[PDB]
Amino acid sequence: VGMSLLALISIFASCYMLVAARSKCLTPYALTPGAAVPWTLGILCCAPRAHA
Amino acid sequence: AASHSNVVFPDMSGTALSWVQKISGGLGAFAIGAILVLVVVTCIGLRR
User: What residues contact B43, with CB distance under 8 A and at least 6 apart?
Assistant: First the structure.
């Protein structure tokens, strides 16, 4: 149980911190009426799949 | 009577299934290449 719980903590923390990195990298583009730079979009997926 | 157990299905390395493996692998490579071509073309279409 201890090893399993530590493994779950590791995986959740890592995935959450990737999500935070995603939002921080993509945050300035949601404050301008600009393009998403498909080079960034393809590597880094976002909620807007096609719009904006 | 037989001294064996009447098992007939050949080995995967045998000539018949080796030949079938070669043919299936060729067709699968063709399908994989076509899938890659379609994926590249549709990704280029999406990126525009």
Answer: A42
Helices in chain B by DSSP H: which ranges?
15-47
d(CA A42, CA A19): 16
Q: Is A49 on the interface with B (CB under 8 A)?
A: no
How was this one solved?
cryo-EM
Tell me whether residues A38 and B47 touch, CB distance under 8 A.
yes
Query: Can you give the resolution of this entry in Å?
Result: 3.0
Which H/E stretch holds residue A45?
none
| Residue of chain B whose Cα is closest to the Cα of A38 | B47
